[PDB]
Design a protein around this nucleic acid. Structure first.
Lengths: 205, 85, 80, 82
RNA sequence: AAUUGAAGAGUUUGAUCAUGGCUCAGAUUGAACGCUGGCGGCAGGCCUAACACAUGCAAGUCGAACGGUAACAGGAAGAAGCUUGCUUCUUUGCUGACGAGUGGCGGACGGGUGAGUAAUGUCUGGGAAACUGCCUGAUGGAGGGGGAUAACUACUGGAAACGGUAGCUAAUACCGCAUAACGUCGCAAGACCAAAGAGGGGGACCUUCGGGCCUCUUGCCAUCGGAUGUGCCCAGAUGGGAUUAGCUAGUAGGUGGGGUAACGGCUCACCUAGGCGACGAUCCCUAGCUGGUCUGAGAGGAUGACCAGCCACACUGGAACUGAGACACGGUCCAGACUCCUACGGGAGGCAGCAGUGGGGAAUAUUGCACAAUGGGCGCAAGCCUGAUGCAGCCAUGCCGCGUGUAUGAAGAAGGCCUUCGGGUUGUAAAGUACUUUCAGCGGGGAGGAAGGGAGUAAAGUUAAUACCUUUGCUCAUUGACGUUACCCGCAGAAGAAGCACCGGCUAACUCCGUGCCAGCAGCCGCGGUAAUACGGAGGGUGCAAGCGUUAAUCGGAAUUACUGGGCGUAAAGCGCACGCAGGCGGUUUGUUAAGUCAGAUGUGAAAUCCCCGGGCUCAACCUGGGAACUGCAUCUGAUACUGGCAA
């Protein structure tokens, strides 16, 4: 399923930072960013109109760590759901359980916070849930189990997470390590960078 | 064939020899009426009709005749006796 | 109330029987044009009270022969 | 003979019986005249486990209809107070 | 709330715009094949030979119908061995029960297959002339006899299959009489027609000592209903071919007799000379049909595997019997081919039930467990039966979910590759270091699918009866194939777990070496003639991921059959030109009709599916509640502008 590879080569192919690493520092400047994704890295291409639609879909797919069969089912459920299907696809990607626990600060990366929720450690509404792709509804409280609480990793990501922009569609206490998903995140709160309409145009091709 | 319900196969043919005796005696009293109305016998057909009418209705009660065929045999024969004379 | 249909007589020469064509005005499934279709039936009459080419109103009855399941009701617009 | 019996639908190890009015000669999931409710045996202690339209069931037993042992049990189980 | 839904590209030329094919990017599949391969969930799994089948199993049940006793377990006697209070053993249907037999019911259901079938089918909507076991409602009846026959003995034919003679015996088997109706026939008068008893308990009384007698349950018979199932008819719709144009004598119609549960040339005789057909009859080829599925923006196109409805078939062909229901998958009889047995006279068999074998094929699985659940047959029940069904095995066949770690980490290690020889890339990648244990593995806990049924007790009902039975409660002991289940908890250790295609344009992703129109690639343009981003290898990169590519097939793109939605001066395309029948269409005004049309209502359009809002599985796939939808058809009631009819 998952990538299980070098997670800065993916950020160099897209150019921008995908927040795939914890970032105790800033740009690591140990990775040669914005210069070369490969051997022919100085050779920048024409990047045609199909390719600019492919790069934006592969950018969003590499942030959350989903695969294409799982991503195409996200688009398919976003198109039939009422409203703007551009921000409906992002409300479902930000409704993932491994993403919400990242934005609450309990994981330093997406792949680290996926390993917490996959290892039977994180419960929703007082019930233990095991998967990464659990769609959380509004006013659901997600807690951390006491056997994996006090884990030399979960609070260590919490003092790292004051610089992570304070996502204000969910309130986090982080002393008791609980948090509720208040409402769905609107389009005006997601990074101002991704062009979701290129993803809707790529699957209509 | 190798069942235990081949008893039904030997039960069916002894009901066939029972029914074919009753069915042939049922319609040979009908043949007494049809042979009488062709000869012009008015009174001899009426006494022959009165001997098949207990016969054809008793077989309708046993299940050999449906009671719609036994009613059909009495209907067209009285329609055949009265048009004779 | 009885379901009944109109229709004109095509032929009559069959000894207490007449045949009757019924014109229905149906629309095409694909093209949407309205096409006249024909419903030639063998209908029953008693004493031959119908020549050729006149409107006869019919209603459905018990089967009277092989392809004869309709009897006459009345005759309007008798042939001249 | 019309029978009011359970037609087992639902997935493997997760049964879901439809309280249905079918002729006795037909199959279990085969033809029927009417369905008059359902029965969920695995719906354990949550909100809702069984529902039977008892007016239509009482209509069919007035016409003459045998009922199965489970259908006779669910009609008993919708009690006078419960 | 029940839809928010429509992309193009390459290639004719020196170049161009058109026209016009070809090809590609998409989705899908009962898939196959190649490489690869961790787990789980829910599904799916001979598409070809409707070819041939070894073996097991798939339909039995009822003693509360009957004669009974071949076993089984007791009891009662008779013996005698002895343990003198315990034995072995002979009678007894005396009981519990029950082989065989008669009888009742089922075997026509469930299951499988798609050969035939182009309409004797199916779908939708109507109709009348029908039947209908079990179920249920109502009203009544249920009297009195008779003659048999299997079983069982005695004998006998045959190798067997299967018989033959003689003598017995019962019934809810069979037959008659009585008795009848709102039943059948008939205008009426009249005439005629049925049955069957068992079981539990019982006070008083007869008690020939078995029982009569009382009560309850249950079955029987007739008629009329209801419900259900089925038979029949009509209209419309449901494939291709006109290089198939005429077809049909029981044919078309009438009358009359006969048949059917019922209408009918269904059948027969006699009369009439019709009937179908260019709106495609007839003939030929192909084919199960539908709800649906796939695709598509839709209209459409293709399709009918799974699930569900209907039909057809059961070695091939033909036939009827029994029965409420069959012209009968695991019935009969006949013929045929095939296989087997035989004492050569004669017999036996039918997997398109489940599993399986051979064969065919590109290809499709276990000779498994259990009646626990849900159904079905039988039974008063207890129960028995059930390859239906519930599960298990096999298979990446499909869809869905998860894992193969996470975070730091620059000596930018070594190594590989490239270089302009400076470096660059592989690459935070690894190593190192710090953590985590899902899943798999090892132990320990542990739901739910279980409702009932049995025993006992109490109450009510019934009755002469606190008896019995029925009903309602309560108590006790129990009933799970799956299954060392889902799930939860504990232990250990980054430990058990990543491929496949591609990198010239289309089309996301490039350099080096080898080869030199060779070997080869290729879906289309086309690459390869010594400096190949196109061949083979290496490094790098891109795509998708327990899969990935290839082939096959369908739709899309294709507006490239154009109803939506195309064209015909020169690109393909106006008949050489007229006249004219059927057909299609029709100026204008008024009246009328309500057919087309439109509005409303009603019945129906099965369920599943699709869609919408919810619910249950840790989410999802999956399951499920309700609604929408099922563009339809039919009837009824209005509207009268337009179209049509009619009249002027």
């Amino acid at each position: 399923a998952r990538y299980l590879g070098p997670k800065l080569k993916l950020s160099r192919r897209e150019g921008t930072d995908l927040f795939l690493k914890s970032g105790v520092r800033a740009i690591d400047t140990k990775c040669k960013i914005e210069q070369a994704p490969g051997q022919h890295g100085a050779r920048k291409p024409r990047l045609s109109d199909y390719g600019v639609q492919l790069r934006e879909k592969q950018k969003v797919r590499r942030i959350y760590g989903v695969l294409e069969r799982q991503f195409r089912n996200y688009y398919k459920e976003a198109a039939r759901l009422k409203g703007n299907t551009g921000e409906n696809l992002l409300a479902l990607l930000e409704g993932r359980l491994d993403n919400v626990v990242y934005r609450m600060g309990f994981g330093a990366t997406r792949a680290e916070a996926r390993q917490l929720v996959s290892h039977k450690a994180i419960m929703v509404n007082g019930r233990v849930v095991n998967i990464a792709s659990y769609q959380v509804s509004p006013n659901d409280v997600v807690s951390i189990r006491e056997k994996a609480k006090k884990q030399s990793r979960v609070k260590a990501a919490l003092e790292l997470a004051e610089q992570r922009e304070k996502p204000t569609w969910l309130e986090v206490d982080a002393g008791k390590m609980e948090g509720t998903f208040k409402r769905k995140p609107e389009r005006s709160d997601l990074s101002a960078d991704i062009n979701e309409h290129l993803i809707v145009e790529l699957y209509s091709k | 064939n190798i069942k235990s319900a081949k008893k039904r196969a030997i039960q069916s043919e002894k009901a066939r020899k029972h029914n074919a005796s009753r069915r042939s005696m049922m319609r040979t009293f009908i043949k007494k009426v049809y042979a009488a109305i062709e000869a012009g016998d008015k009174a001899a057909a009426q006494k022959a009709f009165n001997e098949m009418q207990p016969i054809v209705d008793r077989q309708a009660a046993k299940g050999l005749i449906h009671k719609n065929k036994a009613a059909r045999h009495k209907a067209n024969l009285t329609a055949q006796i009265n048009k004779l004379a | 109330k009885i379901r009944t249909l109109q229709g004109r007589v095509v032929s009559d020469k069959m000894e207490k029987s007449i045949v009757v064509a019924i014109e229905r005005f149906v629309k095409h499934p694909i093209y949407g044009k309205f096409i006249k279709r024909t419903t030639k039936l063998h209908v029953h009459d008693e004493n031959n009270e119908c020549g050729i080419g006149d409107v006869v109103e019919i209603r459905e009855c018990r089967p009277l022969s092989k392809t004869k399941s309709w009897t006459l009701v009345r005759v309007v617009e008798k042939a001249v | 003979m019309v029978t009011i019996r359970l037609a087992r639908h639902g997935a493997k190890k997760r049964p879901f019986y439809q309280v249905v009015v079918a002729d006795s000669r037909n199959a279990r999931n085969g033809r029927f005249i009417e369905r008059v409710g359902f029965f969920n045996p695995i719906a354990s202690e949550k909100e809702e486990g069984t529902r039977l339209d008892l007016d239509r069931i009482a209509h069919w037993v007035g016409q003459g209809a045998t009922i199965s042992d489970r259908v006779a049990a669910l009609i008993k189980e919708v009690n006078k107070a419960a």
